[PDB]
Design a binder for this molecule. Structure first.
Ligand code: CLA
Ligand code: CLA
Ligand code: CLA
Ligand code: CLA
Ligand code: CLA
Ligand code: CLA
Ligand code: CLA
Ligand SMILES: CCCCCCCCCCCCCCCCCC(=O)OC[C@H](CO[C@@H]1O[C@H](CO)[C@H](O)[C@H](O)[C@H]1O)OC(=O)CCCCCCCCCCCCCCCCC
Ligand SMILES: CC(=O)O[C@H]1CC(C)(C)C(=C=C/C(C)=C/C=C/C(C)=C/C=C/C=C(C)/C=C/C=C(C)/C=C/[C@@]23O[C@]2(C)C[C@@H](O)CC3(C)C)[C@](C)(O)C1
Ligand SMILES: CC(=O)O[C@H]1CC(C)(C)C(=C=C/C(C)=C/C=C/C(C)=C/C=C/C=C(C)/C=C/C=C(C)/C=C/[C@@]23O[C@]2(C)C[C@@H](O)CC3(C)C)[C@](C)(O)C1
Ligand SMILES: CC1=C(C/C=C(\C)CCC[C@H](C)CCC[C@H](C)CCCC(C)C)C(=O)c2ccccc2C1=O
Lengths: 89, 172, 142, 180, 617, 126
């Protein structure tokens, strides 16, 4: 039970109807937590990748894909430049 | 000028060279150039294996080889998934497939990042049935890939034909 | 430094117990215990939420020792023992814990990353050992 | 020279070639000319098949759902789209077109031409060359050129023939003779 | 290790995301990876909201009676609550239109919400995976074509979940059919549809498909305009970032305006608090994005621009004219708005409210009557009445709105003046001719040449952010009081008392704080107790910002030196702490200014949020 | 009931998520302060950053890039710096003040040389 505060809550008479049951049970909450744990593992991987930066051999020892080769050659998709610009064209 | 043998008028998709099925060079809409062939081959093998199993599953359960337990008897292949999803059976199969696919996620991530050096589709189950001869090993891999492709198309067929004509069985 | 990660800085031997020679065998014992404890914690958690059709009668936890006809318990023990006696360490393994399973993932992995995987395994096994100890003692006593 | 040395400008009479381009599109767009020949040959082939498929059903028709097959040419298309025949024909033609032309033309078929540009896969030499039935070509360049010219002339004739046939059939109806 | 000072923290943390200075991940692939990680964080935040709405929330009870139920955000489990407060509180209520958005986009169950949370977590995992592998290939992803395709797909979703989709005959299978068949899911009725009191879902879906198609066409046109006249002469991450930030700020401010006046979420206007919070929040976000556009323009000038005879060179050459004219505009607007407000204050105070200077906003009234209104409300410009009018929530302006809009113009022009002045003087002033060699942010140039406090280009943003917050406060006070008068049906208390600023105090701030302050007192505490507590907390943060802004370093450095002396002379601790490890030093001047600004704006935002909640509850 | 659910999950996680997670974050950040790689990318001359720069140089000199890159030394862009200077020399001799004794190579050496020992990359004995 709540003590209403604010003129509009009293005037409009909106009631905070609590659902009878919970809504997510416990099994589906566990599944959400598992998926969040996988996302956390991926986030740890991303953090380790970004903190130590990109190693110099990759992008230098790994040959560019033919798509990347042709894009850099023709200057597309932000290449032939020094910007990111996700909203390029 | 390699002129991929499958589509003669198209240039060979260069990154397919050296892979098991690359001698036919069938990648029009060349996607090996945009996507790493490691990921493409892992996806192809996963689809092929899932379909090689799902084909046999659909055939066996449509013929009438239901499991021992009740809640498995009298359930057709079509209205099977919606049934075992409320019987609690699809949840545990999803759990097992989930741990297998977390293994798969680790393998794909580490392989693409270059940390591990496994081959695409190699989950280290086997390696004592591989023919141990490099030509024969590549032949076995090609057999797996061709059977997986045939099974992908076959399961697509079987499923669509069954669901379009519910009153039928495997010959369709 | 296989087990030493970061909460420590050195070997945790208050009662000096490794002192060479024993250290390798104790490492095998600890790694096996950690693996068993990790899978045992997973076991405690999951049967409470799904039950493997055919097993939806037995009680979980230590009560499963009472339930699950002793023939079935002996079959589980037979599988475990068949593995334990019939697997053996591989060959050029890092120790008696190297039973070859997944060792392909260590091929050309650098010393730091191989040791990091080792330490992750061992620390997770230690946490799972204390976790199972808590689970079993809590289920039994209270 | 005229139209980058493409085949098709030859006249029937003699070495006095036709070279029909009153609006001069070949000179104005020489780098877009392989695309022009691709479009011309594609339209010609489609029109050959289309005129043949306007003539043949007046003689023999496949058994089918009786709404698309047992219909005249002009009113066939709508009923065939409804019956699900032309949707499968579209699936087939779309797969063929995407793979073949969209990969021979776009070096990045996974990207629209607004993003890939290029379009250098269509050269002047391999304009209509989809490598289909090339063993039937005569083994000398002169007769290869003559056969390509035959294909182009028949394709243009089929374009005009299909246009006239469909227009007359809409105006009148009838069968193979689309006269009143 | 760690033989640095505490200054190291605030020195690196101020540039911790200045990846251009981070030589490791300096490539644009790394910046795209940062974008992927940020989008993963956004997806997880939306997953948070959806998960707590579906877990402990009344969405299933909300779809049934959207007018009579208050949306629940999450369950409150604070251990500090007293049993009564525990019995008092049900759960944390909702201050955002996520219930309305979910209802609009077709959610009808908590199972759908749970699947949405799972999908959001999976998409965040996908974003993290994409960030794991930066690559020129991934730089292909994006573009106006991609965002237009996203708009088209959203149109498809809205078509699939439009209320009339049940009556829709399958177009792709049975043909387009009659026009009404398409009207089941694609409409252009225009304006509020009555009932839900929001734009029809068919209208939104049709809007999105049209916008996506037009965006595809516009992107193709822009790229052919790049075919001929291909000139990427000035590429900089800060130039493109400024472009994106300015466009995003314009779009967000437009979103606030057109979402108040054309709500797209069903049963949203019935919820006053969520509407007010939406408008205020989006206007603050838009102003912040515009300020960021100006800031990154200044940064591009500082360290990425090379002088040429181009657009920017022309702007720089006549920067004195720009600054002088902006100063004149601001002086005129401030003088006249303040003087008219003071004149109205004097007239109302002296019991002569008729003698106030009320300049009727005849130009905006002319625009409204001629272009927007369908009935003669003012009668100037046009008096025609529309036979079939459409509905919306466009306010009817009066005399006070003229002065308020002039205050808004003063605020915007002063903010632009500060930002433009700082950006263009980043190239140098006669007090600091060589600012091109000192970087975007620095303390000062010392006491010489008469003094050089706040002479840095970053200090220009520091000064202009107060003006950003002040301008947003001005027009959000305007919006909040206007909608409060409209909802309370006064509409004459506003139109008369907004002419003089004592009205803005008494009838707006003092009047609307009555319920908020009673959140907790000797009698007890109600649901507004949390907001009174946050009100006080925000005031405390604001005054701490005052501390960091007024008092400067040297004093505090000497005080900290004496405190270090006390520690080194203290017993039982000189054996342990020699001040060599992370030496405690006073915050640098730039760090102090930023932290004071941060406390100032944090108190600003939290104070106004608490006030809005306590006033529109 | 409605309360159950978030009550038990909260009693488990909220102590964890706030106390354990925040305290661990604070302690690990204090450790990171005393770590060798503390803000390594933003501390000039840090060991990790210098090793990364050295390895970048090694990769650049071992795997030449077909595309032209922004020259770290602006004069290193020249395809033939010899021709650059030879031209300068010719132009300077054309516009030399009378028989000046100043030559182009000496001027280039004088302009290129600089005595800034306090600039880093020079305080690291480099
Ligand atoms: C099966 C149990 C077991 C075994 C055999 C080992 C074995 C080992 N651990 Mg280890 N460890 C364990 C459990 C175990 N651990 C657990 C649960 C934790 C979590 C706290 C740790 C944490 C840990 C750290 C942090 C480190 C080790 C290290 C080591 C190695 C050297 C230590 C040594 O010589 O002692 C081996 C012998 C024993 C551990 C005796 C086990 C049986 C004793 C007698 C039990 C004593 C009572 C115990 C508290 C149980 C409570 C019940 C009691 C009230 C009756 C060795 C390989 C070191 C290492 O890796 O070297 C680099 C190291 O730094 N361990
Ligand atoms: C050691 C573990 C264990 C044990 C003792 C059982 C025991 C049983 N299972 Mg079973 N099961 C298990 C794990 C286990 N399950 C797991 C992990 C899965 C998932 C892969 C299944 C999936 C499963 C299905 C799908 C079925 C059983 C069935 C059965 C019953 C007949 C089995 C039979 O005749 O097999 C003979 C030996 C081969 C029996 C009670 C059947 C059942 O329910 O019987 C009514 C049945 O149809 N099981
Ligand atoms: C492939 C050979 C094989 C055969 C013929 C059997 C046969 C049997 N097992 Mg069994 N089992 C097997 C492999 C096999 N198992 C394996 C590989 C495991 C894993 C370790 C088990 C684990 C297991 C358990 C845990 C139990 C059985 C039980 C049983 C008996 C009745 C239930 C049943 O059939 O479910 C199969 C039956 C005699 C049950 C039993 O003892 O029945 C009284 C029982 O509780 N089994
Ligand atoms: C046929 C049954 C069987 C057999 C032959 C063995 C045999 C062995 N077990 Mg064992 N074990 C079994 C069943 C069995 N186990 C079961 C059912 C479990 C429960 C999961 C375990 C759990 C277990 C642990 C936790 C450990 C062993 C260990 C050992 C080895 C002790 C070596 C030693 O100290 O020399 C005298 C030995 C090879 C130890 C080992 O190999 O590491 C030292 C060890 O630490 N076992
Ligand atoms: C997508 C948009 C975007 C992007 C990518 C960037 C990117 C960048 N900006 Mg930028 N900026 C933006 C928008 C953006 N900005 C906007 C909108 C503004 C205007 C507000 C600015 C204003 C701005 C300035 C003034 C500066 C930058 C700078 C930078 C660069 C370094 C960032 C850094 O390390 O800051 C460090 C980031 C922080 C210290 C974050 C502060 C943490 C906040 C304040 C926590 C407080 C919230 C707290 C939880 C509230 C508690 C409430 C209380 C009641 C409890 C980097 C390239 C800097 C630069 O390039 O200088 C060379 C610089 O000086 N930006
Ligand atoms: C801009 C495009 C867009 C967006 C943002 C959404 C968003 C949504 N749709 Mg949707 N939809 C769209 C287009 C879109 N739709 C189109 C074009 C159609 C017609 C084919 C539909 C048909 C549709 C149906 C039929 C349903 C939704 C539903 C939903 C909601 C939950 C879906 C979810 O996450 O779980 C599903 C997804 C996952 C569990 C995993 C995500 C899938 C991959 C892994 C991530 C994608 C990565 C991304 C593309 C980059 C969510 C609000 C559901 C709902 O309840 O809404 C009311 C629902 O039942 N949509
Ligand atoms: C109430 C507080 C207040 C006031 C009045 C001002 C006023 C002003 N600020 Mg300002 N500022 C403030 C707080 C304030 N600031 C704070 C807290 C910050 C954060 C540090 C800033 C940061 C800031 C920056 C960074 C800039 C300004 C600028 C300006 C000027 C803008 C031009 C203008 O509006 O002229 C109107 C002037 C007034 C309203 C002052 C009052 C004048 C009289 C009393 C009112 C009129 C009475 C009547 C008409 C005169 C009678 C005439 C005759 C009968 C005698 C103006 C003098 C800009 C500037 O100087 O550009 C020109 C500029 O660049 N300010
Ligand atoms: C509600 C939210 C509103 C409150 C947030 C408002 C913050 C205003 C936005 C401006 C942010 C950009 C400013 C910026 O990065 O530069 C502001 C300055 C820029 O950094 C300064 O750069 C200078 C040279 O450019 C010198 O190096 C200074 O030492 C360095 O501090 O950053 C700092 O001063 C950071 C110090 C405070 C860091 C504390 C981290 C807080 C994290 C807690 C969470
Ligand atoms: C190549 C091939 O073919 O196969 C390969 C595949 C692959 C994947 C590559 C491989 C691998 C790796 C694997 C299999 C990794 C599995 C790791 C697991 C299962 C770890 C579990 C930890 C559980 C913990 C810490 C529990 C902790 C529990 C705690 C802290 C519980 C604590 C409390 O319970 C206690 C104590 C009291 C309770 O009341 C309260 C709570 C909190 C629940 C292999 C081995 O290479 C084999
Ligand atoms: C490996 C492999 O597989 O080999 C393959 C390779 C490859 C290349 C695909 C092959 C081929 C070639 C093919 C398939 C060639 C087919 C060519 C066709 C069908 C040409 C039709 C022309 C119709 C015309 C001009 C209609 C003309 C109609 C006219 C002028 C009609 C004109 C009027 O109708 C109009 C306009 C009005 C009417 O009222 C009156 C009339 C006058 C009748 C191979 C060798 O085969 C097999
Ligand atoms: C109060 C004040 C200080 C003193 C404030 C300081 C030194 C910062 C206060 C630190 C707070 C109290 C946290 C102290 C450390 C905490 C234990 C958190 C540590 C976090 C790190 C581990 C990252 C200044 O240095 C200063 C400098 C320039 C102008 C004005 C002022 C000013 O007003």
């Amino acid at each position: 039970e709540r003590i209403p505060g604010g003129k509009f809550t009293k005037a409009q008479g909106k009631i905070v109807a609590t659902p009878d049951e919970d809504g997510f049970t416990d099994s589906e909450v566990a599944l959400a937590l598992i998926i969040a744990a996988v996302v956390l593992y991926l986030a740890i991987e991303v953090t380790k990748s970004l903190f130590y930066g990109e190693d110099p051999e990759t992008t230098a020892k790994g040959p560019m894909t033919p798509f990347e080769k042709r894009v850099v050659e023709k200057g597309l998709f932000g290449s032939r430049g020094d910007s990111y610009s996700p909203f390029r064209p | 000028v390699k002129m991929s043998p499958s589509v003669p008028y198209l240039p060979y998709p260069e990154r397919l060279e050296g892979w098991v099925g690359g001698e036919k060079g069938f990648d029009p809409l060349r996607t090996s150039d945009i996507i790493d062939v490691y990921w493409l081959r892992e996806a192809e093998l996963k689809h092929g294996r899932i379909c090689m199993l799902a084909t046999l599953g659909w055939i066996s359960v449509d013929a009438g080889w239901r499991f021992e337990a009740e809640m498995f008897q009298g359930v057709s292949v079509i209205n099977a998934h919606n049934k075992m999803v409320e019987m609690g059976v699809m949840q545990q199969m999803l759990s097992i497939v989930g741990v297998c696919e977390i293994f798969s996620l680790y393998l794909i991530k580490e392989g693409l990042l270059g940390k591990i050096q496994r081959k695409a589709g190699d989950y280290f189950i086997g390696k004592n049935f591989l023919p141990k001869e490099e030509d024969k090993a590549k032949d076995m891999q090609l057999k797996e890939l061709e059977n997986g492709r045939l099974a992908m198309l076959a399961f697509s067929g079987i499923c669509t034909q069954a669901n379009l004509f519910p009153e039928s069985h495997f010959p369709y | 430094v296989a087990g030493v990660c970061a909460p420590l800085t050195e070997k945790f031997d208050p009662l000096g117990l490794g002192t060479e020679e024993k250290m390798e065998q104790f490492t095998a014992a600890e790694i096996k215990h950690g693996r068993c404890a990790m899978i045992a914690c997973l076991g405690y958690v999951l049967p409470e939420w799904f039950r493997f059709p055919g097993c939806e009668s037995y009680e979980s936890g230590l009560g499963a020792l009472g339930s699950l006809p002793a023939e079935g318990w002996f079959q589980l023990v037979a599988l475990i023992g068949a593995h334990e006696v019939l697997v053996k360490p591989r060959e050029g393994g890092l120790g008696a814990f190297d039973f070859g399973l997944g060792s392909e993932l260590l091929e050309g992995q650098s010393a730091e990353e191989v040791e990091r995987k080792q330490t992750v395994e061992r620390n997770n096994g230690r946490l799972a050992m204390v976790g199972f100890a808590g689970l079993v003692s809590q289920e039994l006593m209270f | 020279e005229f139209a980058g040395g493409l085949i098709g400008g030859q006249s029937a009479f003699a070495s006095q070639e036709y070279n029909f381009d009153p609006l001069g599109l070949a000179e104005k767009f020489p780098e877009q000319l392989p695309f022009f020949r691709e479009a011309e040959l594609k339209h010609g082939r489609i029109a050959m098949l289309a005129w043949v498929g306007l003539v043949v059903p007046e003689f023999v028709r496949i058994p089918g759902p009786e709404k698309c097959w047992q219909a005249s040419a002009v009113d066939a298309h709508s009923a065939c789209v409804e019956t699900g025949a032309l949707t499968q024909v579209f699936i087939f033609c779309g797969t063929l077109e995407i793979c073949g032309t969209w990969a021979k033309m776009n070096p990045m078929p996974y990207l629209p031409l607004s993003q890939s540009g290029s379009t250098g896969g269509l050269t002047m030499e391999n304009a209509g060359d989809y490598r289909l039935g090339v063993n039937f070509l005569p083994d000398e360049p002169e007769k290869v050129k003559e056969m390509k010219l035959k294909e182009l002339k028949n394709g243009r004739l089929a374009m005009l023939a299909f246009g006239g046939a469909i227009t007359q059939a809409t105006l009148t109806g009838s069968g193979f003779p689309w006269l009143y | 290790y760690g033989r640095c000072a505490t200054q190291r923290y605030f020195q690196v943390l101020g540039n911790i995301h200045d990846i251009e200075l981070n030589e490791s991940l300096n490539s644009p692939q790394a910046i795209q990876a940062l974008s992927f990680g940020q989008l993963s964080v956004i997806l997880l935040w939306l997953a948070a909201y959806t998960f707590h709405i579906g877990w402990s929330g009344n969405f299933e009870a909300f779809i049934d009676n959207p007018l009579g139920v208050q949306p629940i955000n999450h369950f409150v489990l604070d251990p500090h609550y007293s049993q009564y407060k525990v019995d008092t509180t049900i759960a944390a209520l909702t201050n955002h239109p996520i219930y309305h958005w979910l209802m609009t986009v077709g959610f009808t169950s908590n199972a759908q919400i749970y699947r949405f949370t799972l999908g959001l977590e999976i998409t965040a995992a996908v974003m993290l995976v994409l960030s794991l592998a930066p690559s020129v290939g991934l730089l292909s992803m994006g573009g106006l074509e991609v965002v237009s395709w996203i708009s088209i797909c959203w149109a498809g979703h809205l078509v699939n979940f439009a209320p009339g989709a049940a009556n829709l005959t399958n177009v792709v299978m049975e043909g387009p059919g009659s026009l009404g068949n398409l009207m089941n899911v694609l409409t252009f009725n225009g304006g509020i549809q009555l009932g839900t009191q929001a734009l029809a879902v068919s209208d939104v879906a049709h809007h999105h498909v049209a916008i996506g198609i037009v965006g595809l066409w516009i992107s193709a046109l822009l790229r052919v305009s790049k075919y001929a006249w291909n000139f990427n002469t000035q590429s900089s991450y800060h130039l493109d970032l400024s472009l994106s930030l300015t466009v995003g700020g314009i779009l967000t401010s437009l979103l606030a305006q057109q979402a108040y006046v054309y709500p797209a979420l069903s049963y949203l206007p019935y919820d006053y608090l969520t509407t007010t919070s939406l408008y205020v929040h989006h206007q603050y976000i838009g102003a912040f994005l515009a300020t960021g556009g100006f800031v990154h323009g200044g940064i591009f000038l500082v360290r990425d621009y090379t002088l040429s005879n181009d657009l920017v060179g022309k702007l720089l050459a006549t920067k004195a004219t720009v600054i002088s004219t902006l100063s004149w505009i601001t002086l005129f607007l401030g003088f006249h708005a303040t003087g008219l407000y003071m004149h109205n204050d004097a007239m109302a105070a002296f019991g002569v409210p008729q003698k106030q200077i009320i300049i009727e906003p005849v130009f905006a009234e002319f625009i409204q009557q001629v272009f927007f209104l369908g009935t003669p409300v003012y009668g100037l410009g046009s008096a025609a009445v529309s036979s079939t009018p459409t509905l919306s929530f466009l306010p009817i302006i009066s005399g006070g709105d003229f002065l308020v809009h002039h205050a808004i113009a003063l605020g915007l022009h002063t903010t632009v003046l500060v930002l433009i002045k700082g950006a263009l003087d980043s190239q140098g002033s006669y007090l600091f001719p060589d600012k091109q060699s000192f970087g975007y942010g620095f303390a000062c140039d010392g006491p010489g040449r008469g003094g050089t406090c706040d002479i840095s280009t970053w200090d220009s943003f520091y000064l202009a952010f107060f003006w950003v917050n002040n301008t947003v406060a001005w027009f959000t006070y305007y919006f909040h009081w206007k909608v409060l008068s409209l909802w309370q049906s006064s509409t004459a208390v506003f139109d008369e008392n907004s002419l003089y600023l004592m009205g803005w105090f008494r009838d707006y701030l003092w009047q609307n704080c009555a319920a908020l302050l009673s959140g907790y007192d000797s009698l007890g505490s109600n649901d507004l107790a949390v907001w009174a507590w946050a009100f006080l907390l925000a005031h405390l943060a604001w005054a701490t910002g005052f501390m960091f802004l007024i008092s400067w370093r040297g004093y505090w450095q000497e005080l900290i030196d004496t405190v270090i002396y006390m520690h080194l002379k203290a017993p039982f601790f000189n054996e342990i702490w020699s001040a060599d490890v992370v030496t405690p030093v006073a915050l640098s001047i730039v760090q102090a200014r930023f932290i004071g600004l941060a406390h100032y704006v944090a108190g600003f935002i939290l104070t106004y949020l608490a006030f809005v909640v306590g006033a529109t509850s | 009931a409605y309360g159950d659910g978030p009550k038990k999950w909260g009693a488990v996680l909220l102590p964890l998520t706030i106390f354990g997670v925040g305290i661990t974050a604070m302690g690990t950040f204090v450790l990171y302060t005393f770590s060798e790689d503390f803000f390594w990318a933003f501390v000039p001359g840090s060991k990790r950053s210098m090793e990364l720069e050295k390895k970048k140089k090694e990769m650049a000199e071992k795997y030449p890039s077909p595309v032209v890159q922004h020259p770290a030394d602006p004069l290193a862009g020249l395809v033939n710096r010899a021709d650059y200077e030879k031209g300068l020399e010719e132009a300077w001799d054309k516009v030399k003040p009378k028989g000046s004794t100043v030559t182009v190579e000496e001027k280039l050496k004088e302009l290129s040389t600089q005595n800034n020992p306090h600039y880093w990359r020079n305080a690291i004995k480099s």
